[PDB]
Amino acid sequence: MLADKESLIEALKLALSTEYNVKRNFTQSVEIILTFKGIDKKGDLKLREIVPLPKQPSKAKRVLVVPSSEQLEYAKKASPKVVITREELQKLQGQKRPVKKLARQNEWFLINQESALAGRILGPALGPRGKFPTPLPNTADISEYINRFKRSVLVKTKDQPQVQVFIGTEDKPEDLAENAIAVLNAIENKAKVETNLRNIYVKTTGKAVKVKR
Amino acid sequence: AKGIREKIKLVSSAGTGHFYTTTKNKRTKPEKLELKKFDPVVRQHVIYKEAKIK
RNA sequence: GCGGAUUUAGCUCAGUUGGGAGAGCGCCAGACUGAAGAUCUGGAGGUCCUGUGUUCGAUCCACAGAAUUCGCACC
RNA sequence: GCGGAUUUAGCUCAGUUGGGAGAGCGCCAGACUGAAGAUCUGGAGGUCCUGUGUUCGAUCCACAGAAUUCGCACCA
RNA sequence: GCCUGGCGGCCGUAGCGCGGUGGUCCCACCUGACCCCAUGCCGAACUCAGAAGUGAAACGCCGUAGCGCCGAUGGUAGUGUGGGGUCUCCCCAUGCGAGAGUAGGGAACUGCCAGGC
RNA sequence: GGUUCUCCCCGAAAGCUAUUUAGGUAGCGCCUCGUGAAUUCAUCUCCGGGGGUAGAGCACUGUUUCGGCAAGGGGGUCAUC
RNA sequence: GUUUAUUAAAAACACAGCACUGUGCAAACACGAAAGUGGACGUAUACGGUGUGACGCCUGCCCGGUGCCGGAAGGUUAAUUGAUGGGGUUAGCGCAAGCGAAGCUCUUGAUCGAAGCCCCGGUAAACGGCGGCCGUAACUAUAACGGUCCUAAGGUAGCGA
RNA sequence: UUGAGCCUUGAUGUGUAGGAUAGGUGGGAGGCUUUGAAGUGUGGACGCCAGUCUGCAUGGAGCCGACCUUGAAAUACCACCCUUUAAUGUUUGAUGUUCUAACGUUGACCCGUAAUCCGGGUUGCGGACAGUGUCUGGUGGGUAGUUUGACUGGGGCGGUCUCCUCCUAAAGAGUAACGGAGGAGCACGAAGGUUGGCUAAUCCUGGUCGGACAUCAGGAGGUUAGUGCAAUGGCAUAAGCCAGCUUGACUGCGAGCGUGACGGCGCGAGCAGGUGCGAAAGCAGGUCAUAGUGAUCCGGUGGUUCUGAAUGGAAGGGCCAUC
């Protein structure tokens, strides 16, 4: 195995202190970090694993969206972190600043299939750091699929030595371990290579933890 | 088991019901060459990796 | 009697998956010698015991026979 | 078979910047010889042990496998 | 009595030869056919269709002593059940018989159910 | 190695299986003494056919030999073995 | 000679030299549980190994195997000494399933590692040891002369039962 | 001198482009701001030039960064990570190198002593040496031990109980001989199945690539056939065969019994389920079978609802894998 849930709960209990959670201004986040050993270019050990958290925290995930007119008034109630119409992509051609912006300060980009401009313009400034869109369903009754991507993280390594993602906030380490172990089941099912681990930590707004395993 | 060109035991757990057995295959000829559908719970013939995984 | 070895190039015997038949050496040419050998490069030299079978292919094995030969069986 | 190592010319073996893949002894041959050995110098020389995956490009990086091999397990 | 079809009783008189006749009935060939089915190639072998045509045959009989095969009455092996004998086990007083051999023997037999002179 | 007074009927003790066996060993009896019991068990008269002790053939493979030729094979000779 | 009285009556061999060997010395031997008494009232020319076969010469020769031991250039892989990995007993962490830190420990053949010996080297008294078939002298055939075989190897330092 | 941890002190880097000296690995979009706290401008001095030192500006101006430009790859701001190794501190093992109150005095001097034992000190000597307790090693026949089957036309050899066949040997059953022929120490990645399919040759005659031969169409229609090691025997509605479709060789019990001596070794009415095999009738414990191991006692090992001297967990047992 990678690890199990008591191993992580027992380390999260420490990551959320005044010693480790060195606070600036607001309610900050917690992170799972996992580092490998024999990892090279072959293919056996590449991920993506889009993991919609078991127990969503105090701070939700930063989802843009792109609807069509009929399902648009559902999605308008449904708390997307921003919206642009399937239409108004026509107007965004050559707007470098917005493109780089949106790729900088959102995390997910859910599109009705009619949006076929978003495939072209946005790649160049999203891909080198590695975050992604998906084809949204076309229906009116759409909330829980917005909420899906408003709660979800990606297991990013296509070629690099280590994987590290947001997993919770300051309030409760126990529900937050149940978040971390769902990431770890998705990994061990994809990259069946186990002893190629270097280390497994957790981490904050800054300082990391040397988890008991 | 004692020799080399000899008939050997390969430890054989089922695909669904845990239960394991053994008897006879051979290191004389190429080894990549079996799996099977039988069931020691008898309920449904489905899957059996043998001792061997083909 | 049984069980082994052996009948493979002048000499000495190597070799066998079971598809090629070997070299130390003697001859032959080649040239160096008038010549010959050394040494030399080239080339060659065969009852591969016979019979039957197994086999893709038996010099080889298995089996029947022949023959040289050895250890023991005998006191 | 537990873990490292190696396999690159006939045999010992370089191969570590991933961009030309080769040296040594020997073999061939010429020069030389009176003919060989020697000495000099050209030529010859491959399942890069296997096959992929990754790469613009793979002996090379990685994985799985076989053999050679070193130490090794053991009170069915 | 005569002829056919189907299925038995039949473990070899329950095996061949030479021929000579038979049918739009029985089979069947034969001549079509992607098929059903697919020859790991062919309908040759089962088939599916049945037109058109005759018995090449398939299949049956009738004549038949070429070749297997059949066989009395009797004699005999040799021997249990005995008594006596007695170079290599005989000869009687009995239980009964394969073969040598001779008269002499040939192409079997029998049924069930439908349909035809 | 030896039955230390009498008597009477059943009663071969003395072997089928072996045995890092050697007058040595596991159960055993065709045995009695006490329980339990049926046409139980056997020779015959018979029913029904596998045996193959005999015995007899030349069918088979293995073959005697005399006849008769079965492109088999020889002798004699022409010839280039 | 008188020495094995007991088969032989010596036809046994006790001499005695010496290369080599055990001791630089509380020596070699230990018998007695504590002796230091043989050797010692003494030194490696004192006393013991294994012998020797008068005397005197003469010990040629040849290291395959196999001994005698010695050594270290070097591998087989140990009491010595413990990389690590897997466990146990258990705090912490788990409504449960169960994870899981020290410490205490179990269990590694981590790694060095030659007694033997691969080996390296000296031994002639250590253990034994002299191959065959093919061809031959003005005759027999003597058996001097000969090619070879991966055989470890052909009667020799003598006098002829 | 040389080995184990450990940063207290150091340090192994120049190429273009980016007004500019770019280890990698990550987060996101901000970070510093009390005047004695920060840069930023510009002088001056050391030189293994890849370090820095030392003077003076100014300082709530807005300055570093996604935000505008560059590239082989970003940079502001917090995370992450210490080693191949040196100088020392602070933690500590070893081997050499020796001095030496251990020690032994079987060496003297002194000494109790007209003293061989023997008491004890100055001294002299070597020296952690000695002493043995087990562990690893062969080294020798320097105690003791044993004589380990039997088969014997009496022995030494050559044969067998094995577990097999045919011969020999008197039919239920058997009964050897240094006697006759010959022998298991094994066997499937299929020598696996249930429907289906039947007919193989020699030699005669033909015909691309010969020179006995290999798919054939035909003979005559012979029941003149093939057996991948050893062998006997199968026997043709073929098992040899061989293509499609694919690997059931069910979990569990059994009336009936074959019977035998504790193992055992054989098979089946019928009953449960559902377990697969086919339309159906219905059919069945896999290599042609013969030759293929444990008296069994001590072992070991792996899972449990079976337990365990007051319990609870739990040794060790029970069930049976696994040998």
From Swiss-Prot, chain A:
Keyword Transcription found: no
GO cellular component annotations of the record: large ribosomal subunit
Superkingdom of the organism of origin: Archaea
Pfam entry (one): Ribosomal_L1
Family annotation (Gene3D superfamilies): 3.30.190.20, 3.40.50.790
GO molecular function, one term: tRNA binding
GO BP terms in the entry: regulation of translation; translation
InterPro entries in UniProt: Ribosomal_uL1, Ribosomal_uL1-like, Ribosomal_uL1/biogenesis, Ribosomal_uL1_3-a/b-sand, Ribosomal_uL1_arc, Ribosomal_uL1_CS
Keywords: Repressor, Ribonucleoprotein, Ribosomal protein, RNA-binding, rRNA-binding, Translation regulation, tRNA-binding
Keyword check for RNA-binding: yes
NCBIfam families: PRK04203.1
Function noted in UniProt: Probably involved in E site tRNA release. Binds directly to 23S rRNA.
HAMAP family: Ribosomal_uL1_A
Assembly and oligomerization: Part of the 50S ribosomal subunit.
Annotated family: Belongs to the universal ribosomal protein uL1 family.
Protein's UniProt name: Large ribosomal subunit protein uL1
Species name: Sulfolobus acidocaldarius (strain ATCC 33909 / DSM 639 / JCM 8929 / NBRC 15157 / NCIMB 11770)
Gene (name only): rpl1
From Swiss-Prot, chain B:
Signal peptide: none
Superkingdom of origin organism: Bacteria
Subunit structure: Part of the 50S ribosomal subunit. Cross-links to the P and E site tRNAs.
GO MF annotations in UniProt: structural constituent of ribosome; tRNA binding
Modified residues (N-methylalanine): 1
BP-aspect Gene Ontology terms: cytoplasmic translation; response to antibiotic; ribosomal large subunit assembly
Gene responsible for this protein: rpmG
Protein name: Large ribosomal subunit protein bL33
GO cellular component: cytoplasm; cytosol; cytosolic large ribosomal subunit
